[PDB]
Write a protein that binds this ligand. Structure first.
Ligand SMILES: CC(=O)C1=C(O)C=C2Oc3c(C(C)=O)c(O)c(C)c(O)c3[C@@]2(C)C1=O
Ligand SMILES: CC(=O)C1=C(O)C=C2Oc3c(C(C)=O)c(O)c(C)c(O)c3[C@@]2(C)C1=O
Ligand SMILES: [Co+2]
Ligand SMILES: [Co+2]
Lengths: 364, 364
């Protein structure tokens, strides 16, 4: 019954994979699924994959230091990998690193990608455990985040080669209200203009008759190309959406739910914390929705209490919400979105939210 | 009613303070208490303090990278601090960094410490917010972990200068069975022999007529000085206590509970995971306890199910248990201990547990 929307998973690079992974277990309803580490011969990195219906996260941490003087000298390729991982956690901190797509024909989707100028990160190769085989490749897309192409061949195991399945459920979830998340809706690994642009232009040059590997990126780039804020050291009436819009190296990963009220509630009660949109947003939005005769399913007054956002067109609307920044840097957010016939991505909420500080800064 | 046993707190250095701190909120029953960061002018580090009755943890993360090229050039003292924090997370990873003691007369306890050869880390100084003042100092003790001496003067605020109080309770705890932890029982920031020794000899030279700042370290060094394992690539019948005993740079922090059964249960059900001691341990222990006429309060059979450990003497016993390593390095553990008239620290369980693999390796 589960539904990946073609996303194999998203892999994070984080300092404490083992413990950070549990954040999503306790706060957001995930379940431990697979593991890769010193128990399956991974001498240099541990990986913890937690899943929520279609949503699958991988958290990956080095298990050892750079010049680890006690046991082995690291092979040259591997010390470079460890070195790379620390330099990313320094520059960026905990965050999404790689979006990986279930793909038929990695060789082909990889080939076209670099023909049109993709920065290669991992030419096609074939990780091969005892449960089978898989072909992957990877390319730089949005900043230093990446896309990975995955073609299952003979592999049958839990997840990928090297991974072992997970030995049973998590107990904290028999006490916690569940979070009905469906699948990964989209992901922008870096929201700098230059960076976004660069990645979008690259995607456009990847368009052909064969369908592009990430429909959700093609529609984001399309919707936001039709147009390309202002802060205050007050807090800002936009609160942390101003950091979302104007912060550097900001990311967000969005997670589709069939019920954003149910989702947001059970996350409010598990202890997750979202940005507060001002009252003036709903003021103006209630008129816009009414004048346009767009009648929502959900009570407008509950969408207000929950600081949930709205965008729409003639055929339907979306419901959107953002967590407070997940870490001590204001750079990583998670979006929860519910669609009722709207392929949109929230372009309207830039105008609306920017207009929200507008009436407040114009107030003086 | 709360009881710190003279421990102001333990401060961890971790990669993701904001999220790691919540681990202890969800998995172990802590509550958010104070915060220090970009919201109180801390341009370089964030601190999250969570408390459980007497137990108070501080988690501290850099909010910025080393050569953060976007905003400020860091002052020389501060870039050194950021640089230091990354080098510790590289060499060691997430773990306890500093044990801090509520102390009258920092100047004096600091003075004697370095007279007898303490490695100074922070001469007496006086952090001074608008709610008052505090004197601190710090010295290297066990490896690169530290002790900090804290003398409240005019400070009245939540916690320390720069900290703001915490805006209300965590919701996940109205759904989770509580964990009745009392206070910090002890802490060994590095269990290498050389390192332990060095720190103990240093403590001994700190003994005088004035009482020593950490009674729990003086008794550890005393009990374990009366004596100073063997592993298998099988897993080991000792399971992860072999990593505890023979692993390098292992730490553990112990947390006293009045009811280790209640504590361990509610932690089993919140999702915390402990090492399994073999059956042969309880086999031999039931005879030892009986021959010695030591009658326990708690059902021996529940202490067996819960992989809880036992040490005792003529006047009473202790009950001990260890988590599985908390991170992808096998280097940080947490001990839960319950005392019934026994100042011991588990020296007996070395003999018992070492003897447990003994009958198993002797089995062949
Ligand atoms: C509202 C939100 O969820 C965000 C999203 O999910 C998809 C994003 O793509 C862009 C792009 C470029 C064109 O792709 C852009 O230029 C701006 C100014 C922008 O604001 C966004 C985004 C970040 C959007 O704001
Ligand atoms: C059982 C446990 O809780 C541990 C504890 O809490 C206090 C520790 O101090 C030592 C010391 C030195 C003398 O202090 C030592 O040499 C050995 C071999 C030792 O094993 C321990 C410890 C680590 C003990 O094992
Ligand atoms: Co969005
Ligand atoms: Co102990």
């Amino acid at each position: 019954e589960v539904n990946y929307r073609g996303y194999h998973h998203a892999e994070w690079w984080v300092g404490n994979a083992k413990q950070v992974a549990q954040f999503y277990i306790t706060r957001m309803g995930f379940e431990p699924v697979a593991h890769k580490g010193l128990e399956t011969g991974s001498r240099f990195f541990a990986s913890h994959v937690v899943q929520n219906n279609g949503v699958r996260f991988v958290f990956t941490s080095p298990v050892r230091s750079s010049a680890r003087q006690t046991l082995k000298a690291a092979p040259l390729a591997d010390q470079a990998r460890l070195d790379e991982m620390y330099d990313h956690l320094d520059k960026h901190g905990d965050g999404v690193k790689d979006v990986a797509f279930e793909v038929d024909d990695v060789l082909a989707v990889y080939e076209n990608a670099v023909a049109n100028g993709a920065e290669s990160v991992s030419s096609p190769h074939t990780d091969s455990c005892d449960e089978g085989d898989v072909i992957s490749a990877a390319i730089k897309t949005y900043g230093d985040t990446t896309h990975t192409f995955i073609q299952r061949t003979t592999y049958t195991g839990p997840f990928l080669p090297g991974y072992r399945s997970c030995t049973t459920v998590d107990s904290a979830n028999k006490f916690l209200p569940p979070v009905n998340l469906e699948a990964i809706d989209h992901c922008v690994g870096n929201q700098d203009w230059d960076e976004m642009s660069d990645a979008c232009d690259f995607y456009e040059r990847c368009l052909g008759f064969h369908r592009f590997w990430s429909v959700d990126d093609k529609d984001i780039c399309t919707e936001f190309s039709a147009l390309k804020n202002e802060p205050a050291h007050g807090k800002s009436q936009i609160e942390e959406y101003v950091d979302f819009y104007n912060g550097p190296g900001v990311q967000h990963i969005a997670l589709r739910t069939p019920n954003i009220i149910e989702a947001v509630s059970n996350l409010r009660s598990r202890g997750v914390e979202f940005i507060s949109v001002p009252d003036t947003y709903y003021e103006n939005m209630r008129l816009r929705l009414k004048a346009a005769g767009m009648k929502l399913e959900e009570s407008f007054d509950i969408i207000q209490k929950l600081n949930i956002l709205i965008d729409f067109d003639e055929g339907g609307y979306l419901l959107q919400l953002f967590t407070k920044p997940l870490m001590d840097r204001p750079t990583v957010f998670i979006e929860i979105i519910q669609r009722n016939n709207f392929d949109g991505f929230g372009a309207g909420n830039f105008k609306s939210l920017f207009e929200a500080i507008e009436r407040e800064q114009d107030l003086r």
